């Protein structure tokens, strides 16, 4: 396919790379610290008007 | 350090309106209560109203309820008090009080003052 | 050079048939299969 002919002669071709591919997905982030105050403001006592 | 700043008072007639106001200064206003407490000339204290940290009403008297409006202002950190229909039974030393603890939000509803001010003397006659 | 898939290695000398590299050299000698050596 690469000599573009049906008769390839005696030697070494270079015809594609080896190229090992994915086996996964890893999306790491740091952990969770300091939660925003989100529980005074939807759990709230009274409100006024 | 607390600086609860008192305005608005003087001799009205029974039926007019007025506005009182207590700005604070020294501490953050988004995080305390402050609740306005009348006292009578050598007959004791009476609570009138309170407001917590956010915008929110806790109750009235038996006999200050539809006639007095309360709210609060955190862009101006002050804390307003309309009043309305006022009689010769309104006469009294009207303190700024605020709260000690933070107001987190799971706890018991138990509200005490703290910090006291100096009143003003709103007279109806 | 790599691994070279698909041909054995003799131990014997030969002149170079095909240039694989670091010295390795490949040719197609006696079954009939591709050698190195």
């Known amino acids: 396919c690469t000599l573009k002919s049906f008769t390839v002669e005696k030697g070494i071709y270079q015809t594609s790379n080896f190229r090992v591919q994915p086996t996964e997905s890893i999306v790491r982030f740091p952990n969770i610290t300091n939660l925003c105050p989100f529980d005074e403001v939807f759990n709230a006592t009274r409100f006024a008007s | ?125 | 050079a790599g691994c070279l898939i698909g041909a054995e290695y003799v131990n014997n000398s030969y002149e170079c048939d095909i240039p694989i590299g670091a010295g390795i050299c490949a040719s197609y000698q006696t079954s009939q299969s591709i050698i190195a050596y």
């Open chain 2, 1 to 125: 350090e607390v600086q609860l700043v008192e305005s608005g008072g003087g001799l009205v007639q029974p039926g007019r309106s007025l506005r009182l106001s207590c700005a604070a200064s020294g501490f953050t206003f988004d995080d305390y209560a402050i609740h306005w407490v009348r006292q009578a000339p050598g007959k004791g204290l009476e609570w009138v109203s309170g407001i917590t940290w956010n915008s929110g009403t806790i109750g009235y008297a038996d006999s200050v309820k539809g006639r007095f409006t309360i709210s609060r202002d955190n862009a101006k950190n002050s804390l307003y008090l309309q009043m309305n229909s006022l009689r010769a039974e309104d006469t009294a030393l009207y303190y700024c009080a605020k709260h000690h603890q933070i107001a987190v939000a799971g706890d018991a509803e138990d509200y005490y003052f703290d910090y006291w001010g100096q009143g003003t003397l709103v007279t109806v006659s």
